XYZ file of C-alpha atoms in Angstrom:
334
model
C 11.605 18.820 30.339
C 8.160 20.451 29.639
C 5.455 18.130 28.103
C 3.922 18.762 24.593
C 0.969 21.213 25.030
C -1.152 20.468 21.839
C -0.984 16.721 22.833
C -1.498 17.034 26.677
C -3.865 20.045 27.361
C -7.683 20.046 26.846
C -10.451 22.523 25.923
C -14.251 21.975 26.240
C -16.773 22.813 23.458
C -20.552 22.253 23.973
C -22.201 19.934 21.345
C -25.881 18.792 21.710
C -26.497 17.208 25.204
C -22.741 16.719 26.046
C -19.440 18.588 26.766
C -16.767 17.511 24.188
C -13.427 17.756 26.124
C -10.636 17.105 23.519
C -6.833 17.631 23.122
C -5.871 21.132 21.795
C -4.546 19.449 18.539
C -8.235 18.778 17.472
C -9.828 22.038 16.163
C -13.032 23.371 14.421
C -15.234 20.556 15.903
C -18.628 20.128 14.067
C -21.211 17.369 14.845
C -21.792 14.618 12.166
C -26.677 4.982 20.358
C -22.853 4.320 20.127
C -22.208 8.028 21.012
C -21.743 11.568 19.544
C -19.293 11.970 16.563
C -17.701 15.358 15.621
C -15.662 16.035 12.457
C -12.453 17.973 13.415
C -9.036 19.119 12.060
C -5.924 17.497 13.665
C -3.358 20.403 13.496
C -0.472 17.928 14.288
C -1.290 15.484 11.372
C -2.804 18.307 9.201
C -5.796 16.047 8.224
C -9.604 15.896 8.836
C -10.597 13.431 11.641
C -13.806 12.084 13.280
C -13.830 12.334 17.144
C -16.333 9.911 18.818
C -17.129 10.388 22.566
C -18.160 7.205 24.475
C -19.640 8.420 27.843
C -19.508 5.825 30.720
C -19.146 2.827 28.312
C -18.399 0.545 31.365
C -21.745 1.626 33.038
C -23.629 -1.008 30.876
C -22.546 -4.636 29.955
C -23.750 -4.169 26.309
C -22.016 -0.715 25.950
C -18.844 -2.181 27.618
C -18.859 -5.086 25.049
C -19.164 -2.610 22.070
C -16.454 -0.278 23.528
C -13.937 -3.064 24.426
C -14.373 -4.887 21.030
C -14.097 -1.575 19.046
C -10.889 -0.516 20.966
C -9.116 -3.942 20.544
C -10.432 -4.589 16.943
C -9.470 -1.059 15.669
C -6.011 -1.403 17.411
C -5.392 -4.817 15.641
C -6.213 -3.507 12.129
C -4.304 -0.134 11.818
C -2.721 -0.045 8.275
C -1.989 2.656 5.614
C -4.685 1.017 3.326
C -7.431 0.861 6.069
C -9.441 3.768 7.646
C -7.611 3.387 10.985
C -7.802 4.444 14.693
C -5.355 7.447 14.974
C -5.773 8.223 18.729
C -7.623 7.161 21.939
C -7.643 9.567 24.958
C -9.586 10.328 28.197
C -9.603 13.766 29.949
C -9.761 11.905 33.347
C -6.365 11.107 34.967
C -7.111 7.966 37.117
C -9.111 4.647 37.060
C -11.368 5.962 39.935
C -12.213 9.212 38.008
C -12.259 7.564 34.484
C -15.648 8.325 32.767
C -15.225 9.027 29.002
C -13.281 7.547 26.013
C -12.605 9.552 22.794
C -11.775 7.569 19.578
C -10.113 9.559 16.709
C -10.535 8.136 13.139
C -9.295 9.397 9.730
C -12.336 11.192 8.156
C -13.020 9.941 4.560
C -15.747 8.152 -8.789
C -12.341 6.490 -9.597
C -14.324 3.570 -11.223
C -15.212 5.854 -14.230
C -11.772 7.648 -14.158
C -9.468 6.736 -17.139
C -6.578 4.756 -15.497
C -3.385 3.232 -17.003
C -1.780 -0.124 -15.945
C 0.556 1.653 -13.424
C -2.413 3.213 -11.498
C -4.825 0.207 -11.845
C -2.167 -2.315 -10.610
C -1.270 0.103 -7.712
C -4.958 0.484 -6.619
C -5.305 -3.374 -6.757
C -1.952 -3.852 -4.884
C -3.269 -1.539 -2.090
C -6.697 -3.313 -1.882
C -4.796 -6.658 -1.512
C -2.412 -5.186 1.169
C -5.490 -3.973 3.158
C -7.276 -7.382 2.861
C -4.059 -9.328 3.830
C -3.659 -7.179 7.024
C -7.391 -7.751 7.910
C -7.019 -11.563 7.311
C -3.769 -11.644 9.437
C -5.797 -10.060 12.343
C -8.366 -12.905 11.833
C -10.942 -10.566 10.121
C -12.640 -11.539 6.791
C -14.233 -8.334 5.302
C -17.029 -10.193 3.373
C -18.540 -6.828 2.164
C -15.894 -5.218 -0.164
C -17.533 -2.928 -2.807
C -16.675 0.359 -4.618
C -18.699 2.405 -2.005
C -16.470 1.381 0.992
C -13.124 2.112 -0.807
C -11.699 5.708 -1.047
C -8.829 6.871 -3.350
C -6.871 10.182 -2.915
C -5.721 12.270 -5.980
C -2.199 10.662 -5.551
C -3.921 7.186 -5.948
C -3.467 6.258 -2.216
C -6.322 3.780 -1.438
C -8.080 3.007 1.904
C -10.843 0.475 2.852
C -13.495 2.251 5.039
C -15.394 -0.695 6.693
C -14.461 -4.098 8.191
C -17.694 -4.650 10.223
C -25.132 -5.102 -2.206
C -25.166 -8.699 -3.599
C -23.182 -7.768 -6.800
C -19.777 -8.248 -5.039
C -20.626 -11.376 -2.894
C -18.838 -14.687 -3.764
C -20.809 -17.748 -5.041
C -20.156 -19.799 -1.816
C -21.875 -16.904 0.149
C -24.748 -16.596 -2.464
C -25.410 -20.413 -2.068
C -24.629 -20.304 1.731
C -21.834 -22.982 1.573
C -19.695 -21.426 4.330
C -16.622 -19.391 3.265
C -12.885 -18.718 3.913
C -10.657 -15.576 3.535
C -10.719 -15.699 -0.331
C -14.410 -14.510 -0.423
C -12.624 -11.092 -0.385
C -10.639 -12.102 -3.555
C -13.971 -12.627 -5.449
C -14.981 -9.032 -4.444
C -11.569 -7.664 -5.679
C -12.177 -9.547 -8.990
C -15.656 -7.908 -9.285
C -14.186 -4.395 -8.659
C -11.218 -5.009 -11.053
C -13.673 -6.245 -13.752
C -15.923 -3.180 -13.151
C -12.901 -0.730 -13.383
C -11.930 -2.194 -16.845
C -15.404 -2.985 -18.360
C -17.228 0.140 -16.983
C -20.244 -1.808 -15.548
C -21.191 -4.177 -12.665
C -19.907 -7.631 -13.818
C -22.608 -9.732 -12.007
C -25.779 -7.532 -11.830
C -28.607 -9.849 -10.619
C -32.160 -8.327 -10.566
C -32.713 -10.458 -7.370
C -30.827 -13.054 -5.198
C -31.903 -15.898 -7.628
C -30.785 -13.953 -10.765
C -27.368 -13.183 -9.081
C -26.467 -16.925 -9.471
C -27.721 -16.889 -13.144
C -25.367 -13.923 -13.998
C -22.408 -15.880 -12.476
C -22.993 -19.173 -14.447
C -24.035 -17.307 -17.678
C -20.534 -15.673 -17.862
C -18.187 -18.125 -15.997
C -20.071 -21.375 -16.893
C -21.596 -24.187 -14.762
C -19.154 -25.075 -11.911
C -17.290 -28.462 -11.593
C -18.728 -31.771 -10.208
C -16.424 -31.271 -7.121
C -17.949 -27.816 -6.300
C -21.542 -29.139 -6.683
C -20.642 -32.297 -4.619
C -19.755 -29.805 -1.771
C -23.300 -28.196 -1.773
C -26.110 -29.172 0.693
C -28.290 -31.683 -1.278
C -31.218 -29.153 -1.625
C -28.808 -26.456 -3.003
C -27.033 -29.036 -5.303
C -30.467 -30.052 -6.750
C -31.284 -26.389 -7.693
C -27.711 -25.755 -9.062
C -27.793 -29.076 -11.091
C -31.257 -28.234 -12.597
C -30.157 -24.762 -13.894
C -29.468 -24.670 -17.665
C -25.772 -25.589 -18.339
C -23.413 -22.802 -19.587
C -19.907 -23.464 -21.020
C -18.593 -20.074 -19.785
C -17.253 -17.121 -21.866
C -13.424 -16.885 -22.398
C -11.879 -13.909 -20.472
C -10.479 -12.659 -23.870
C -14.207 -12.127 -24.891
C -15.450 -10.803 -21.455
C -12.361 -8.484 -21.194
C -10.914 -7.797 -24.699
C -7.380 -6.282 -25.131
C -8.742 -2.907 -26.371
C -10.601 -1.990 -23.081
C -7.157 -2.129 -21.285
C -4.376 0.408 -22.136
C -2.774 -0.749 -25.475
C -0.182 2.000 -26.316
C 3.265 0.409 -25.555
C 4.752 -3.133 -25.861
C 4.737 -3.057 -21.998
C 0.910 -2.401 -22.103
C 0.331 -5.571 -24.251
C 2.258 -7.738 -21.686
C 0.495 -6.037 -18.689
C -2.954 -6.655 -20.355
C -2.232 -10.460 -20.512
C -1.020 -10.204 -16.857
C -4.147 -8.192 -15.789
C -6.566 -10.681 -17.505
C -4.605 -13.683 -16.075
C -5.062 -12.269 -12.499
C -8.767 -11.490 -13.276
C -9.304 -15.147 -14.494
C -7.826 -16.431 -11.142
C -9.993 -14.127 -8.889
C -13.386 -14.654 -10.686
C -13.383 -18.446 -10.008
C -16.699 -19.896 -8.664
C -15.003 -22.693 -6.631
C -13.092 -21.011 -3.737
C -10.769 -24.103 -3.469
C -9.482 -23.082 -6.996
C -9.594 -19.249 -6.436
C -6.235 -17.374 -6.003
C -5.314 -16.475 -2.351
C -4.392 -12.887 -1.225
C -0.713 -14.002 -0.712
C -0.452 -15.458 -4.283
C -2.279 -12.381 -5.769
C 0.285 -10.011 -4.079
C 3.043 -12.123 -5.809
C 1.226 -12.082 -9.237
C 3.388 -10.344 -11.929
C 0.691 -7.607 -12.517
C 0.688 -6.706 -8.753
C 4.166 -7.671 -7.428
C 5.937 -4.687 -9.208
C 4.632 -2.666 -6.153
C 5.609 -5.266 -3.480
C 7.111 -3.694 -0.291
C 7.305 -5.902 2.862
C 6.483 -2.716 4.932
C 2.967 -2.641 3.301
C 2.396 -6.331 2.281
C 3.814 -7.968 5.519
C 2.908 -5.118 7.990
C 2.379 -7.255 11.139
C -0.878 -6.735 13.126
C -0.218 -5.813 16.829
C -2.440 -8.859 17.785
C -4.958 -11.355 16.227
C -8.633 -10.463 17.055
C -10.671 -13.421 18.518
C -19.141 -11.948 31.019
C -17.388 -9.387 33.352
C -18.350 -7.274 36.438
C -18.846 -3.454 35.865
C -15.466 -2.747 37.644
C -13.630 -5.408 35.483
C -15.024 -3.856 32.217
C -13.966 -0.365 33.515
C -10.408 -1.637 34.317
C -10.159 -3.528 30.937
C -11.342 -0.430 28.914
C -9.072 2.008 30.908
C -5.949 -0.224 30.386
C -6.737 -0.173 26.601
C -6.864 3.709 26.723
C -3.589 3.809 28.805
C -1.776 1.750 26.048
C -2.127 4.955 23.861
C -0.217 6.766 26.725
């Protein structure tokens, strides 16, 4: 029983100050503190990938920290709707000889694209699947925005990062402390932007960002303001009062698809979901679980995507302990 050659045999290519020694599957390598990163083509998967070399990551405590967190964090969070770790390998064949770690990542407009309800609800479904998986691995994104989401021509969506002010939730703006559903506010902002064709809350500065929120959604409840630090409450109380604009005025029927009788029902569904995500008070904001079960979204629901279990929940060593810990993480990828 001969072993797979493209997956087990290495070639070297010189890049800057370092020999890149990679599996034969990774071809046409081109360069693009953490380490050197080459773009490549994975001939097995038939996709573009980024190959990152970490040289002697165990040789420094601070480098070891970075390396060990990145390996365990990226392993926790692999999902079809997240830019994921595809492969980890080392050319070296024993703990004693172990020097280098290679990480392989997937290498990767639609705002202003004319979408129908089918495509919009699918993009939103996929965003929510990606956020749920992150939350289940104990990661809150906190920084969701159009410029860290990619869509393929077939409307397959992936989130690029998981560690501007337009997409940040009120509780973050006012520094109240936050839970998972900060990410729901961001989804609301992106959904609003997709439909309305502009940034929903476009503050000229950090002070104006709050003004844009209350101007459109209205002054928040006594309960929300009671939860603020007294100095923050005092500012928020002294703002002019706003009643809020009805979501039928902010997001009229005619800016959603209106062709069929199905479109009319889906527009009410879309606006209903939007009215439950763009809620100032996070205690009253829809959760990711409830959003995935919302009639607008749940037509796409597949346990394999929505309940895709994370391999583990993400939460001072000697040089030789760090080395051993990193190497065992590489050996899990066979």
